[PDB]
Amino acid sequence: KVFGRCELAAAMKRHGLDNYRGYSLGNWVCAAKFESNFNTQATNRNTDGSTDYGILQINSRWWCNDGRTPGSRNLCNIPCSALLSSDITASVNCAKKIVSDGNGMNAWVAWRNRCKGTDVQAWIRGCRL
Numbered sequence: 001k002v003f004g005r006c007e008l009a010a011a012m013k014r015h016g017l018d019n020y021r022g023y024s025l026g027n028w029v030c031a032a033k034f035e036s037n038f039n040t041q042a043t044n045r046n047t048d049g050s051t052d053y054g055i056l057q058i059n060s061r062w063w064c065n066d067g068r069t070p071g072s073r074n075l076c077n078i079p080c081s082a083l084l085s086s087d088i089t090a091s092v093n094c095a096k097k098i099v100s101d102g103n104g105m106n107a108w109v110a111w112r113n114r115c116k117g118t119d120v121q122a123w124i125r126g127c128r129l
C-alpha cells in the first residue's frame with residue numbers, strides 16, 4: 001500500500017509514535033517519505049548483501065529475517081516480509097526498538113541527511129491529528 005501523507009501521519013500517531021523517544025510525529029512521516037515514498041512494499045538491496053524493508057526500510061542484517069542475510073541477528077523477531085504488509089504495526093513496533101537502542105533516528109541515513117534539522121512539522125500540516 002502507498003499511504004497518503006496525512007493518512008500515515010494519522011496511523012503512526014494512533015500507534016503511539018508521536019514523540020516516542022522525543023521525535024515529533026513529523027520526524028517520522030519525513031523519514032518515511034524519503035525512505036520509501038510512503039510505499040510499504042518497498043525493498044532495496046545493499047552491497048553487504050542485506051536488504052531494507054517496508055515504509056521505514058528496516059534492515060535484515062539486524063532487525064528481521066528474510067533468510068538470505070547471514071550475519072543476521074533478528075532482534076525484531078519478525079520475518080522481513082511482515083514489514084511489508086499494509087498494516088504498519090510490525091514496522092512501528094520494530095522501529096521503536098531501533099530508535100530506543102542508541103543512535104536515535106540517526107539509524108536512518110535518510111532521516112539524518114534530509115530530515116534532521118529542517119522544520120519537520122511541515123509534513124503534518126493539513127492533518128486532522
Ligand SMILES: CC(=O)N[C@@H]1[C@@H](O[C@H](C)C(=O)O)[C@H](O[C@@H]2O[C@H](CO)[C@@H](O[C@@H]3O[C@H](CO)[C@@H](O)[C@H](O[C@H](C)C(=O)O)[C@H]3NC(C)=O)[C@H](O)[C@H]2NC(C)=O)[C@@H](CO)O[C@H]1O
Pocket residue numbers: 035046047048052056057058059061098101102103107108109110
Ligand atoms: C548505503 C547506506 O548508507 N545504506 C543505508 C543503511 O546503512 C548502510 C550504510 C547500508 O545500507 O549499507 C541504513 O541502515 C542503517 O544501517 C546501520 C548500519 O548497519 C544501522 O546502525 C547500526 O545499528 C546497530 C544497532 O542500532 C549498531 O550496533 C551499529 O553500530 C553503530 C556504529 C552505533 O554505534 O550505533 C550501527 N551502525 C553504525 C555504524 O552506526 C542502522 O540501524 C540502519 N538503519 C535502519 C533504518 O535500521 C538504511 C536505513 O535508512 O539505509 C540505507 O540507505
